[PDB]
């Protein structure tokens, strides 16, 4: 009953301040881990020479 003081959902006891966002739960819940991207590795690296074709 004191939860809604505008001082609880802010500056809580050693915890995250409740910036209440809503993430897309269809993804993003199991093992997603931030970052810009997977730094997409260039297709073909070591067979550009000796093309094997």
């Amino acid at each position: 009953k004191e939860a809604k003081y505008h001082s609880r959902q802010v500056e809580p006891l050693g915890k995250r301040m409740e910036r209440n966002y809503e993430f897309p739960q269809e993804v993003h819940q199991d093992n997603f881990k931030f970052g810009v991207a997977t730094i997409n590795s260039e297709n073909t690296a070591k067979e550009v020479m000796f093309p094997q074709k």
């Binding site: 995250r16 301040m17 993003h28 881990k33 931030f34 970052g35 810009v36 991207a37």
Partner: protein, 432 residues
């Protein structure tokens, strides 16, 4: 085959070692009982008991029983070896002479016995890590005595000191400048590498980046543990460019006296506002050098840079590292010492950071931990010298020290040593 021994003294060191040991155990997947559920990287920190669990290579020392007993009764009761948790009976009570002349002399023998019984099992000892808050009597005294004993008992083995100097204005005790300056004199000629960890900087980082306005000690300990893991991960995780403990002092120490470095870590963002951005390598390495993110309350813009060693962990690429370092060199606000054309050392590791459930930190691929030797560090020594001088002008609190057996004239020697140290810094900092 490669191992390092960890020493904790003073309740601050104990409480930060606790945080280090949740993090290492969770990183290696070991449950609190010490058993592994289901290669041999753990050999860096742990040792097989012969059948089943693993035991850490750590020792805890204190003259006050409460913290050690809380450790013995906490959730990690079944992990630590029972007779390496050395506890005394009566606390030093912020008196450096108490912890260095009367009470610590009785416990140093047991500590040395345990250190020997740990080192004989080890075969490829990399070195020692030591944790101790500086402003406390028992911490300073036992750190000094242990370091002095070890330097003559073992000789040339590397030793790393993770010291927490007092904040510029924020303070807890009222006499901690005295024991801080004394312990600094003691460890100046005994420690190969000492790092700065004044707490007010961590409070600022937690307030700004983590956005927690009332942080508790656990968060600070968690950050320090993350930094330790970042430093050490190269020994127990494969990487494209690995660096050992011995590959720190060979590249960070221009002169034998100058071995105090300050560290920074990045990225520090909560999971709440990290999903919204990308955190590329260039911006994380810029934030690493950004002055307010240094966990030492010193302004790097007020002095020159001497040497920078940075560890990248995750999926970083050497071309990206070179592209970032070129921009850092191009930037004008940061200038290096004249007689070092190149001053960067770079390490790269694959295993991305781990996150503790219920913690504040967030789980990314790319992380950077930077350790810098710079000429700007003289400010903290000057301000502590001033605080010492104001108190020592009228011999305040001197009786509490002189009645414990420590000689009156010892303070003058430490004062002269500090003056010599700042003289050496200002002499090195000039260009040719």
């Amino acid at each position: 085959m490669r191992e390092v021994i960890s020493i904790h003294v003073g309740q601050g060191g104990i409480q930060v070692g606790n945080a280090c040991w949740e993090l290492f155990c969770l990183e290696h997947g070991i449950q609190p009982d010490g058993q592994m559920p289901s290669d041999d990287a753990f050999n860096t920190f742990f040792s097989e008991t012969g059948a089943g669990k693993h035991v850490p290579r750590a020792v805890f020392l204190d003259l006050e029983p409460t913290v050690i007993d809380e450790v013995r009764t906490g959730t990690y009761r079944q992990l630590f070896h029972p007779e390496q948790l050395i506890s005394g009976k009566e606390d030093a009570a912020n008196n450096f002479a108490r912890g260095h002349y009367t009470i610590g002399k009785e416990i140093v023998d047991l500590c040395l016995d345990r250190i020997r019984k740990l080192a004989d099992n080890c075969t490829g000892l990399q070195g020692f890590l030591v944790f101790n808050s500086v402003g406390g009597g028992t911490g300073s005294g036992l750190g000094s005595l242990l370091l002095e004993r070890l330097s003559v008992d073992y000789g040339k083995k590397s030793k790393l000191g993770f010291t927490i100097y007092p904040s510029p204005q924020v303070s807890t005790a009222v006499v901690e400048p005295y024991n801080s300056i004394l312990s600094t004199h003691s460890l100046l000629e005994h420690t190969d590498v000492a790092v700065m960890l004044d707490n007010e900087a961590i409070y600022d980082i937690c307030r700004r980046n983590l956005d927690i306005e009332r942080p508790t000690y656990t968060n600070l300990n968690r950050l320090i543990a993350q930094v330790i893991s970042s430093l050490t991960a190269s020994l127990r995780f494969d990487g494209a460019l690995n660096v050992d403990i011995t590959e720190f002092q060979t590249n960070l120490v221009p002169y034998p006296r100058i071995h105090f470095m300050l560290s920074s870590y990045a990225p520090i963002i909560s999971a709440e506002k990290a999903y919204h951005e990308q955190l590329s390598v260039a911006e994380i390495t810029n934030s690493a050098f950004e002055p307010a993110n240094m966990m030492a309350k010193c302004d790097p813009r007020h002095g020159k840079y001497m040497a920078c060693s940075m560890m990248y962990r995750g999926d970083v690429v050497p071309k990206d590292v070179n592209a970032s370092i070129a921009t850092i060199k191009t930037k004008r606000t940061i200038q290096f010492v004249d007689w070092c054309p190149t001053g960067f050392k770079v390490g790269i590791n694959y295993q991305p950071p781990t996150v503790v459930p219920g913690g504040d930190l967030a789980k990314v691929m790319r992380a950077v931990c930077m350790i810098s030797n710079s000429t700007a560090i003289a400010e903290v020594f000057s301000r502590l010298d001033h605080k010492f001088d104001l108190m020592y002008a009228k011999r305040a609190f001197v009786h509490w020290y002189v009645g414990e057996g420590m000689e009156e004239g010892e303070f003058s020697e430490a004062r002269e040593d500090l003056a010599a140290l700042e003289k050496d810094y200002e002499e090195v900092g000039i260009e040719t």
